[PDB]
């Protein structure tokens, strides 16, 4: 596997606050079609890595999703967290902005003054995001089936039919979400997807912000997000158990998975 990076994973190494690589970050000078961005990248991955773009929910900014930047980048990914053009953008616009941010990561990979010059394998990309940004990630996956992985959290879209999605998709859900209730949002979205590796991980007692920065389940949520991205962005079957397993955890009120290997 030419995409495999880093030491062999263990539960401990995936639950830790940081992975094996050192992370640095920068602010995007001229965002291409979105509001603002921060790029997180490993300084010592030892080969090119995939890129992941992460979008917040309605009203929200990078702070809500920023913890993913160092968590993922320290396991060997370039991660861009964005602010949208308006905090009040809807899922479709969020998806366009998310893909523009991936395009700009690809640009920076080819820009000799960038810290990520030659760090990115632009053929291997993923999408994440919270709430309307989670709906935007599912729209991105539907429209761009060559994306390698999606892992939205507490997603919402005014449509729940994502039978279009063929990209491996992990849905984080929050049991007690009152803003995008699981039974009308995350779960029907999950159930709609028929052609992909997929997983549903609902956090016991979680509010709508249960997978955001500052959450109290970073060990489990970070292990699953990293494992999913490693398995599917890097084709890295060292992560197949971590990606596919039911954690059998008292922190999880609902687990489902299909077509996972
Ligand atoms: C029925 O659905 C809605 O009312 C709704 C409202 C807000 C959002 C959202 O993006 O929340 C995340 C906060 O940043 C998603 C769905």
Residue numbers in the entry: 1 to 261
The paper states:
Specifically, I. sakaiensis adheres to PET surface and secretes a unique cutinase-like enzyme that degrades PET. The enzyme is named PET hydrolase (PETase) for its PET preference.
We therefore produced and crystallized the double mutant R103G/S131A (DM) for complex formations. A comparison of the wild type, S131A, and DM crystal structures suggests that these mutations did not significantly alter the overall protein fold (Cα root mean square deviation = 0.144–0.2 Å). In DM-HEMT, the ligand is bound in a groove containing A131, H208, W156, I179, W130, Y58, and M132. The H208 side chain is within H-bond distance to the ester O atom of HEMT, W156 that adopts the “B” conformer is T-stacked to the benzene ring, and the other residues provide hydrophobic interactions. The proximal carbonyl group lies adjacent to A131, presumably facilitating nucleophilic attack by S131 in the wild-type enzyme. Judged by its binding mode, the HEMT in the complex behaves like a substrate analog. Therefore, a fragment of PET that consists of two terephthalate molecules linked by an ethylene glycol was docked into the enzyme based on the DM-HEMT structure. Notably, the conserved W156 residue shows wobbling conformation and only W156 in “B” conformation is favorable for HEMT binding.
